[PDB]
Amino acid sequence: SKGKKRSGARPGRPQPLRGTKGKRKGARLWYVGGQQF
Amino acid sequence: SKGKKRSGARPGRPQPLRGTKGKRKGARLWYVGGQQF
Amino acid sequence: PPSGDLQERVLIRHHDYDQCFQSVQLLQWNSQVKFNVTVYRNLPTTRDSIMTS
Amino acid sequence: RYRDVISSFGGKTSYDADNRPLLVMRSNFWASGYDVDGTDQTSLGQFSGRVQQ
Amino acid sequence: MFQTFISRHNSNFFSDKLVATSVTPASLAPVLQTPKAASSTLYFNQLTVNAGNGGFLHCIQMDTSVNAANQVVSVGADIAFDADPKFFACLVRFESASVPTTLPTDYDVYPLDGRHDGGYYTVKDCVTIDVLPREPGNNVYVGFMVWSNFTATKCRGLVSLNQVIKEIICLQPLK
Amino acid sequence: MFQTFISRHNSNFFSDKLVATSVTPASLAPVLQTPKAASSTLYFNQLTVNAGNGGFLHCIQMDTSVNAANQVVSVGADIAFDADPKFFACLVRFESASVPTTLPTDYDVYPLDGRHDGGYYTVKDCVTIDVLPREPGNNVYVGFMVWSNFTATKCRGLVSLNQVIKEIICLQPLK
Amino acid sequence: MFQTFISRHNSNFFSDKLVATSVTPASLAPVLQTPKAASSTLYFNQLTVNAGNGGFLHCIQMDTSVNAANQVVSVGADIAFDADPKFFACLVRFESASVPTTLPTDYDVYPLDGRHDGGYYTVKDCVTIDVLPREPGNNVYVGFMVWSNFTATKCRGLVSLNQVIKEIICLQPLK
Amino acid sequence: MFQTFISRHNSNFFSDKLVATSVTPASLAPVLQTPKAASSTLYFNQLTVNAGNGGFLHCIQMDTSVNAANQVVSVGADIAFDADPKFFACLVRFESASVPTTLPTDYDVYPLDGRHDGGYYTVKDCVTIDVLPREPGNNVYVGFMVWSNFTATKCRGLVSLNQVIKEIICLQPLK
Amino acid sequence: MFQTFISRHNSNFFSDKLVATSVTPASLAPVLQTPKAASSTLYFNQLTVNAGNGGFLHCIQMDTSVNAANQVVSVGADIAFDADPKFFACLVRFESASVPTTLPTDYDVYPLDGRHDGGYYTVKDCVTIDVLPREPGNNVYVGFMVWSNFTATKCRGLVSLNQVIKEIICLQPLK
């Protein structure tokens, strides 16, 4: 084996998932020909 | 009789049992031929 | 009032509490406990027991 | 295993020599929750567990 | 699926055979067997019915230990006549200062939803009734009554009555 | 098992005998006995039915003390005819400025799930009805009606009606 | 005991008489009376049935004000034939661009638990049905249908249909 | 609409054919097949009934693993006789020190609400019964019994018995 | 009053006509129409039954997408025979490696509470069944079966089967 043996339990309540992606933004990904809202 | 006459009630909630054994570890007990996870 | 001789009255009859509880498979009381035992022995290790040399 | 034999001499093997995956992280925990009580005529006195961690 | 665990009768656990071989219906309806306690099941494999106008019944006495005015009384029955003696069935409440052998002239009747089919009748129901003596020094009797313009015929079946003054416990595997 | 403790009729505790020996069905359906109060049980051990087209009924008056538009009305019945006069049974609502002896020309009908078997009929049901006079200075009557192309025959049974304006208390050993 | 306060039909409060004296069953089943609204009770004291194979029915139109695909539709009926025309009863859904007088060739059928007894039939049930037009520019009709290999006979009774698009309020003394 | 998910019988998932071709009713009522376990379904496509007074029955043994005095026992049946042998059906409890072939002289009876129709009978019910041996060193048997003044006839159908000592799991899409 | 909103069948919304004119009962009971999906309603206005011992049935295939051992299966039926062919009805489970045209020699039966009346039969029920193949590489079929010592006669009606693997949504005005 190598290197982990950590732990991960947290207290609280399981809040619902909010936003599929996004922790840190880079450059643009999509180009449609203008703004779209 | 001899020597006890103690008491044992505690307040709180009966949390579920967590782990069958383990209060203080000694030496190894089981040898399978390597690591097993 | 309890019936019988003196020894029958002094001892507890658990049929006297049948109408107090609802019928379940776990009798009249149940408990779930973890025993944290620790003993200091003079024994060889598991390694010493399985190795000839 | 071969990586065990080399370790007993005091040596080392890379995971490329053995052709094995590399473990980067490992996590462990216990899962808990609470109970829900029934309140109608038949289920008054009955409980149901809900594990969420 | 789940199990129901709720019912309407809750029979007695002990059943008694009818010590009699014939009955004669009349306006003073005869009682089949001596009333007892607050619960009783009566079964009869063979009963001869003679010609007559009126009825006959099976009853129980009312327990007055608990001081509650209104209580629930249950019935479960299954009767089979050989002929079709067009008849109606009901619940009857009456009072008597001694052990009764017939039905007095003052009484009340109640409707219960049965399953008439011609010679056949089945029921399993409950009705709320005032059980206190309503007149000092008297006993209250509640019975299951059959009334018709009877002819000579035969019948078989069983009748069960219960007064809800205590609750019955049962095993529930999940609870 | 547990006891149900929920029902659909809740009869009156006092029953009355029919002071009559015959009825003649007609389009102006005759009332069997004088209406009263908000609850009434009527039993008859013998009633002669003459030949005629139409029906007859047993009714009660509606109590207007509580100002609530819609209320529940219950019925429990058990009738046995000697012949098979193919008939249908329903709940009828009508209005009158005085005590009625027949059915007026304006009325409503409602269906209730009974147990026709040929000469036999049983029911135990409840229906929501608008109970306020709907026209100033009038009384409202609700009854149980039987309608057919009748011939000469005979019947026996009992009919019970109830208007749910108050609740009935009963003994519950666990509560 | 307590009162139930839960039901399966909830009739209309206004009943209508059948303006007709005969019907002829056919594969294109005739409609008894002009459909209306989302609730209708029809009673008939006398109807003549002519010989024919097929059926006849009583229906209502579907209200499309609320944009909900599936809704509950209730029925309460009580029919009495003089003979025994072995027949089965069901719930039928069909569509038409104008007011219908017969049953079109495309339709669906649904089973409902009735109480056949020979000349007699009673039911009180509810069924979930898709009520939106399923094809642009059409109306949806739901009815109660009787089908058999009919002969010349007679019948009486009443039929009531209801579409659950609103809830009915009632008086509860404890609440 | 929602699905009920609550029932009264909960059959076994495995059914057995009757290895027999005739039965003779008697006061010592014969057992149709060898009792087994706490649940059993028996179906028979053809059974010959000989003339005799008394009855016959199908039973199961009681499981005593769980120390609970009172338990629920269910039944679901459907029988069809060719003639109309006026009969009544019940639930019977008895005890025996060995495997039984007839009914002993000491037993109890219980009423259950069936659907007699003349040659036809259907039931689906549950009854609470005391299941412990009540006398040391004995087994308890509970069965479904049919009793009449039988003549020579024929019958077909199936009978299913169940003892509620465990609960059955089912799929619920929303839970 | 309130609306029930809980039921036991939940039919399909699409019904199919029987493409056949006769059936011959046998110990290898014929299948009326090709099985399909997990839900199917079949209605037939005219079916000729030839003389024979055994039965016939209408079935559906079981969906194995969800890995749950036990599931609920519903039925709603209404059949009318011209004569009285004393018969019993049940639910049958069997297995086949290809599309079946008859009933194999290995199968199970289950009781359901119907309403036999002589030529008439009605039912609306649900039963829990193990739906997984129980033997690798096989399909599971569940049907509604009628069994008797049939003679030459005729019948009409409809049969509907449903497997509870999803839930049906309906409009509730208060929620």
Measured in angstroms, the CA of I100 and the nearest CA of chain E are apart by 29
The Cα G64–Cα H54 span in angstroms is 63
Cβ of E169 and C23 within 8 Å? yes
Which are the contacts of H103, defined by CB distance < 8 A and separation ≥ 6?
A: H28, H29, H30, H31, H57, H92, H94, H145
Structure tokens at I151: 């003679």
Q: Report the Cα–Cα distance between both ends of chain B, in Å, rounded.
A: 49
Which are the contacts of E102, defined by CB distance < 8 A and separation ≥ 6?
A: E26, E28, E29, E30, E31
Cβ of D28 and A1 within 8 Å? no
CB-count exposure of residue I95 (10 Å: 0-12, 13-18, 19+): middle
Residue C5: φ, ψ to 5°: -75, -175
The Cα G44–Cα G16 span in angstroms is 9
The Cα A27–Cα A22 span in angstroms is 12
The Cα I36–Cα I59 span in angstroms is 8
| Of G38, G35, G126, G121, the residue nearest G78 (C-alpha) | G121
How many Cβ contacts (< 8 angstroms) between chains E and I?
A: 3
- If you count them, how many residues does chain E have? 175
The Cα E51–Cα C45 span in angstroms is 97
| Of H164, H89, H93, H151, the residue nearest H122 (C-alpha) | H89
H or E stretch including D44? none
The Cα F117–Cα H116 span in angstroms is 12
> For chain G, which chains pass the contact test of at least 3 CB pairs under 8 Å?
E, F, H, I
Answer yes or no: are the C-beta atoms of I39 and I106 closer than 8 Å: no
The Cα E151–Cα E82 span in angstroms is 11
| Interstrand relation of F6-7 and G2-3 (parallel, antiparallel or unpaired) | parallel
Answer yes or no: are the C-beta atoms of G12 and G43 closer than 8 Å: no
Closest chain B residue by Cα to residue D49: B16
Measured in angstroms, the CA of E55 and the nearest CA of chain G are apart by 28
Touching, E vs F (3+ Cβ pairs under 8 A) = yes
Answer yes or no: are the C-beta atoms of I60 and I163 closer than 8 Å: yes
Q: Which residues pair with E142 in a beta bridge?
A: E60, E93
The Cα H104–Cα F26 span in angstroms is 61
| Interstrand relation of G87-96 and F15-17 (parallel, antiparallel or unpaired) | unpaired
Answer yes or no: are the C-beta atoms of I62 and I137 closer than 8 Å: no
The Cα E132–Cα E126 span in angstroms is 18
| Of I88, I83, I17, I7, the residue nearest I54 (C-alpha) | I88
Structure tokens at E63: 């327990």
H or E stretch including G109? strand G108-110
For CA atoms C46, C48, C50, D3, the dihedral sign is: positive
Measured in angstroms, the CA of B2 and the nearest CA of chain D are apart by 41
CA H57 to mean position of chain CA atoms = 7
H174–chain G Cβ distance below 8 A for any pair: no
Residue A35: φ, ψ to 5°: -85, 150
Structure tokens at H37: 């376990």
Which are the contacts of F46, defined by CB distance < 8 A and separation ≥ 6?
A: E149, F21, F154, F156
Q: Which residues pair with E29 in a beta bridge?
A: none
Answer yes or no: are the C-beta atoms of B23 and C36 closer than 8 Å: yes
Interface with A, mutate which of D12, D14, D16, D29 (most A CBs under 10 A): D29
Closest chain G residue by Cα to residue E128: G1
Measured in angstroms, the CA of H128 and the nearest CA of chain F are apart by 7
| Of E35, E86, E59, the residue nearest E145 (C-alpha) | E59
G47 to G20, G50, H124: CA distances (angstroms): 8, 10, 39
Answer yes or no: are the C-beta atoms of H72 and H7 closer than 8 Å: no
Which are the contacts of F116, defined by CB distance < 8 A and separation ≥ 6?
A: G80, G115, G117, G120, G122
For residue I1, which residues of chain F lie inside 8 Å, CB to CB?
A: 72, 126, 128
I1–chain F Cβ distance below 8 A for any pair: yes
Which are the contacts of F1, defined by CB distance < 8 A and separation ≥ 6?
A: E4, E5, E6, E7, E10, E168, E170, H72, H126, H128
CB-count exposure of residue F67 (10 Å: 0-12, 13-18, 19+): exposed
Q: Give the 3-state secondary structure of residue C16.
A: helix
| Interstrand relation of F39-49 and F15-17 (parallel, antiparallel or unpaired) | parallel
- The amino acid present at G12, given as its one-letter code, is N
- The amino acid present at B9, given as its one-letter code, is A
E2–chain I Cβ distance below 8 A for any pair: no
| Interstrand relation of G153-164 and G70-81 (parallel, antiparallel or unpaired) | antiparallel
Among the partner-chain residues A4, A13, A14, the one whose CB lies closest to the CB of D23 is A4
Residue I140: φ, ψ to 5°: -115, 135
The Cα E12–Cα E41 span in angstroms is 7
The Cα I140–Cα I160 span in angstroms is 18
Residue H130 neighbours by CB distance under 10 Å: 16
Closest chain E residue by Cα to residue I71: E1
Answer yes or no: are the C-beta atoms of G50 and G151 closer than 8 Å: no
Among the partner-chain residues I5, I116, I168, the one whose CB lies closest to the CB of H122 is I116
E169 to B17, C39, F142, H29, H128: CA distances (angstroms): 32, 47, 43, 31, 9
CA E123 to mean position of chain CA atoms = 11
Write down the number of H helices and E strands in chain H.
Answer: 0, 12
For residue F71, which residues of chain G lie inside 8 Å, CB to CB?
A: 170-171
The Cα I48–Cα I151 span in angstroms is 11
Among the partner-chain residues C23, C24, C27, the one whose CB lies closest to the CB of H70 is C23
Which are the contacts of H115, defined by CB distance < 8 A and separation ≥ 6?
A: E115, E122, H121, H122, H123, I113, I115, I116
G172 to E32, F61, H127: CA distances (angstroms): 43, 20, 34
Q: What is the DSSP letter of G113?
A: -
Q: Report the Cα–Cα distance between both ends of chain F, in Å, rounded.
A: 16
Residue E63: φ, ψ to 5°: -85, 130
Residue located via tokens 């499309």: G64
CB-count exposure of residue E154 (10 Å: 0-12, 13-18, 19+): middle
H or E stretch including C10? helix C6-10
Touching, H vs E (3+ Cβ pairs under 8 A) = yes
Cβ of E1 and H170 within 8 Å? yes
Closest chain H residue by Cα to residue C15: H69
Cβ of H71 and E115 within 8 Å? no
For residue G81, which residues of chain F lie inside 8 Å, CB to CB?
A: 86
CB-count exposure of residue H136 (10 Å: 0-12, 13-18, 19+): exposed
For CA atoms H125, H130, H131, H135, the dihedral sign is: negative
Residue located via tokens 């307590």: G2
| Interstrand relation of H153-164 and H39-49 (parallel, antiparallel or unpaired) | antiparallel
Answer yes or no: are the C-beta atoms of G86 and G36 closer than 8 Å: no
For CA atoms C1, C4, C8, C10, the dihedral sign is: positive
Residue located via tokens 């050993």: F173
The Cα G56–Cα H38 span in angstroms is 51
CB-count exposure of residue I41 (10 Å: 0-12, 13-18, 19+): buried
The Cα C38–Cα C51 span in angstroms is 26
H or E stretch including E147? strand E139-150
Measured in angstroms, the CA of E87 and the nearest CA of chain I are apart by 21
| Of F97, F90, F78, F79, the residue nearest F141 (C-alpha) | F97
For residue G77, which residues of chain F lie inside 8 Å, CB to CB?
A: 111
Cβ of C22 and E173 within 8 Å? no
Which are the contacts of G117, defined by CB distance < 8 A and separation ≥ 6?
A: F116, F117, F118, I117, I120
Interface with D, mutate which of A4, A13, A15 (most D CBs under 10 A): A4
F1–chain H Cβ distance below 8 A for any pair: yes
Residue E175 neighbours by CB distance under 10 Å: 16
Residue G61: φ, ψ to 5°: -85, 160
Closest chain E residue by Cα to residue C23: E171
CB-count exposure of residue I70 (10 Å: 0-12, 13-18, 19+): middle
For residue G126, which residues of chain H lie inside 8 Å, CB to CB?
A: 1
Q: What DSSP assignment string belongs to E79-133?
A: EEESS---EEEEEEEEEESS--SS--S--EEE-------SSEEEEEEEEEEE-S-
Residue G146: φ, ψ to 5°: -120, 130
The Cα H126–Cα F1 span in angstroms is 9
Answer yes or no: are the C-beta atoms of G167 and G99 closer than 8 Å: no
F124 to E45, E160, I25: CA distances (angstroms): 31, 21, 41
Residue B35 neighbours by CB distance under 10 Å: 9
Answer yes or no: are the C-beta atoms of F40 and F61 closer than 8 Å: no
Q: What DSSP assignment string belongs to F61-107?
A: EPP-SS--SEEEEEEEEEEEESS---EEEEEEEEEESS--SS--S--
| Of H48, H75, H57, H53, the residue nearest H156 (C-alpha) | H48
Residue H157: φ, ψ to 5°: 150, -160
The Cα F75–Cα F55 span in angstroms is 18
Residue C6: φ, ψ to 5°: -65, -40
